[PDB]
Amino acid sequence: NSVERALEGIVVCDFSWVGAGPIATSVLAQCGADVIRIESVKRPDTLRRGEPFKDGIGTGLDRSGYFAARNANKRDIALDMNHPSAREVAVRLIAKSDIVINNFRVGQMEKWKLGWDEVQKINPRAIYVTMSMQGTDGPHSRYMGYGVNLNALCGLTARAGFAGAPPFGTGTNYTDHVMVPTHTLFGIMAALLEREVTGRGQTVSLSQLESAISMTPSAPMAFAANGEVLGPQGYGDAEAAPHGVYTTLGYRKWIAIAVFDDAQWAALRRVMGNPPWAEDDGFASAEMRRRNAAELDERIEAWTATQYGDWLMAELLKAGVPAGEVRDAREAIEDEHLRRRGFWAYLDHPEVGVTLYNRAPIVFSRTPLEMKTAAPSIGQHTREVLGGMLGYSHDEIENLVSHEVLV
């Protein structure tokens, strides 16, 4: 029974402990990499104390789904890195690691003598990954921010809102979730690919602001080209018409409908029963539907409001019209499509029982992602790693953890 994993044998020394770092290494762990989190019991990941918790009971450090969902498949060793004997342990691990990633305050790894200069000598194959809000030098290099702050700073939030209203953003700390982790992962993989040739690791460094702007080009490009700020457009579109969010029957129920050409508009008319109003010259062309968008939306919503959105979505899709119910998290969890795709995965955990996780959004035809173990507790693998991978004697292990260098 031979399972093939794309990153078989890859070892990750993972000091990262909030934000995008752990999201990136979650993906590596699903590809067969051995991701070993370094987590001090004195300095636990703050998400461990963040809701949601199993049954809303936030006791201890192993009940948060905020923490758990980003940490499946990982091993966890409890190292106190400001204890001298802990450095020697990290050195042994770095000597065996393909990837070293961290979020410590600028200059901290250097203070521990674990910067790139020293890591390159411990292991010239090691790839050394760091990130910052917006770069480690320059006038704003000491500034502080979270994902929601970067949504704002990168230009996304100003263009995520209704025209004439306060902007909203995504409602989430979005830059942390995909923008930053995918660029981190691509940089890691690029370094791994180059290392197949050169035999050398190298540094990979990310400014989170620059990764975010790179996926939101229109705001700055339109201003640079045309000297005018490109405003937000609500749930409209610059080309599609009609294009919007419309009420259907039930509590906070909406359907998204997006029409891109006259054939799709004829199909929407067909599904609507070909009401005479929709035959007006004012809606005959994409250009006129854009011009008359406000009236068009009112007339569409008057009709959708009488319909069940699941039935209407199905009828529109079967007519070739892009449509989709505006799903809440329960509807996404229960979706036939995501479940048939195997996106959602349930994993057993010794304290919270069976709970919901998901694989990364990649279906590999030969080396598929795997979901094997729930998020680890602090120090769950300390003895296993120290003894099995890092070569410490039983006596040395118990000495390291009786003196509470490791827990």
């Binding site: 700073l153 490109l230 457009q233 909406w254 048939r340």
Partner: protein, 407 residues
């Protein structure tokens, strides 16, 4: 020599192109494949000035910089033969075709990799190559709706707003570049490529923050952030909006600097904020807590510019950022210090174009913008010659409409 040894075919449109751009940015030989009708991204804005022609789409120019361009009609037997020869010499094919289309033309993965076992084929689609939604059309809005992501961009019963720059597409493309690189790495070692299937609906489900766990663990449906006083809240100021994270959880050490900022600036009623009730999430999300916070803070913010609040809030060690517009972005002194903005003369347009720059830095690899995005069929001739076609065979292909070469 960086990624120059990798050949990437990129058959993408409005959906798909950022993934091949990431390969191009590290120096890969990337060939954008269009039909003779032209990449549809050429026909969507925003635009360079008042131009609306095939080279005027700022998105087209951005996502397809660093690529050569060919035009092939895969509806033509001869075109399918040229495409097969191109794939025989490719490390990677990225495409966003409708599920089933290439298979129906006799261009399945098995056919494309028959004499190229290492070929990686990455498919970027709204719903995946398989499953009950695979037959059906999707767009940025409707994927966002179906994934759960769109619903989070509002509160209470308010309709949600869209994220800019087609984030359904961008999230899939970023994960598709990652999956492509992982499969390429695996192919370097095994001699075997595979199919990499990345669906927008799954990629966006990666961006639900903790909404899925709120349902699984607590039976709660969440929507967007923005109504927890001082925690990921947006506030009007004299010339726009700012984003604030003054506290999360019960983290009073975050809050105290914020109170000191208010005191130092002489803000009316600042003492209202100097109270441990603000350390409680339940109070911060209460109607009176949120309203009182906004009353006190916005009396101050409305009198000050984005730039002033950014400067002074960060001086006090509070996570404040501007809701930057395009003008703010081009003027940002940190991005200027970092040399982020890349300006490249465009001969087709007869003007300089400014683009976002590098999302990451490497010790040994160099990011680059690469060449201006191709005109339709700009490199059809030179690329087919590269695959062993002579002039006469190529002239045959043009005259029969199997490929299109520019003037």
């Amino acid at each position: 020599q960086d990624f120059s040894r990798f050949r990437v075919l990129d058959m993408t449109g409005e959906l798909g192109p950022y993934a091949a751009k990431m390969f191009a940015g590290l120096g890969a030989d990337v060939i954008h494949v269009e039909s003779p009708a032209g990449d549809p991204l050429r026909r969507v804005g925003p635009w360079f000035g008042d131009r609306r022609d095939a080279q005027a789409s700022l998105q087209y120019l951005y996502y397809n910089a660093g690529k050569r361009g060919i035009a092939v009609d895969l509806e033509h037997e001869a075109g399918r033969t040229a495409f097969r020869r191109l794939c025989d010499g490719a490390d990677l094919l990225i495409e966003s075709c409708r599920p089933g289309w290439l298979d129906g033309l006799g261009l399945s993965y098995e056919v494309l990799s028959r004499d190229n076992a290492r070929l990686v084929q990455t498919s970027i689609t709204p719903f995946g190559r398989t499953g009950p939604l695979a037959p059906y059309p999707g767009s940025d809005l409707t994927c966002s709706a179906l994934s759960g992501f769109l619903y989070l961009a509002g509160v209470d019963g308010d309709k949600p707003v869209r994220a800019p720059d087609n984030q359904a597409y961008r999230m899939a493309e970023a994960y598709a570049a990652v999956g492509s690189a992982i499969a390429l790495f695996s192919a370097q070692r095994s001699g075997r490529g595979q199919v990499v299937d990345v669906a927008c609906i799954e990629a966006q489900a990666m961006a639900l923050e903790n909404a899925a766990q709120f349902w699984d663990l607590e039976g709660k449906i969440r929507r967007g952030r923005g109504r927890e006083a001082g925690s990921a809240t947006l506030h009007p100021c004299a010339d726009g909006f700012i984003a604030l994270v003054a506290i999360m959880g019960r983290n009073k050490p975050m809050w105290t600097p914020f109170v000191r900022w208010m005191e130092a600036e002489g803000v009316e009623e600042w003492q209202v904020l100097d109270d441990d009730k603000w350390i409680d999430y339940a109070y911060r999300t209460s109607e009176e807590g949120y309203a009182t916070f906004c009353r006190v803070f916005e009396r101050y913010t409305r009198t000050r510019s984005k730039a002033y609040l950014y400067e002074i809030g960060q001086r006090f060690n509070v996570a404040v950022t501007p809701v930057s517009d395009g003008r703010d972005l081009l003027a940002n002194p940190q991005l200027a210090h970092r040399g982020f903005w890349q300006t490249q003369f465009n001969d087709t347009l007869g003007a300089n174009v400014t683009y976002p720059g590098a999302p990451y830095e490497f010790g040994e690899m160099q990011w680059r913008l690469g060449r201006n995005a191709p005109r339709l069929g700009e490199h059809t001739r030179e690329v087919l010659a590269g695959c062993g076609y002579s002039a006469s065979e190529i002239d045959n292909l043009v005259r029969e409409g199997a490929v299109y070469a520019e003037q």
